[PDB]
Amino acid sequence: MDELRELLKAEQQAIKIYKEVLKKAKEGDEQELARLIQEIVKAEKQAVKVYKEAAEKARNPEKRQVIDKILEDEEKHIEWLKAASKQGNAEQFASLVQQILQDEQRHVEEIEKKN
Numbered sequence: 001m002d003e004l005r006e007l008l009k010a011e012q013q014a015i016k017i018y019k020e021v022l023k024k025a026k027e028g029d030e031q032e033l034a035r036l037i038q039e040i041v042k043a044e045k046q047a048v049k050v051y052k053e054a055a056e057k058a059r060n061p062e063k064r065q066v067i068d069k070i071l072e073d074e075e076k077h078i079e080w081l082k083a084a085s086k087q088g089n090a091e092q093f094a095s096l097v098q099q100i101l102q103d104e105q106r107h108v109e110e111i112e113k114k115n
């Protein structure tokens with residue numbers, strides 16, 4: 001019923017790791033990225049599992065009012081990270097890292113709305 005109180009922590013944590021990866025993407029420190037993109041992949045991978053399980057645990061319409069809406073962005077983002085990792089190119093990667101960071105920065109307000 002009230003899983004959104006731990007999903008708030010997950011969104012705050014997701015912003016804080018995307019903030020680090022953005023600095024590494026602008027530094028061009030690709031030997032850190034080869035052992036750190038796995039952690040933003042895990043931020044989405046955890047979200048698509050926990051939000052789907054939280055929808056099955058839902059018992060209140062207001063504490064359910066954003067679960068599926070945030071999940072619909074995470075199901076997009078987990079596929080964008082695959083494309084960004086297999087196109088064979090990273091010319092504009094930091095722009096996408098910030099474009100996902102800015103989306104987690106709205107999810108952290110939506111998940112808090114009915115706390």
Ligand SMILES: [Zn+2]
Binds near residue numbers: 044074077100104
């Ligand atoms: Zn995401």
Ligand SMILES: [Zn+2]
Binds near residue numbers: 108
């Ligand atoms: Zn999110």
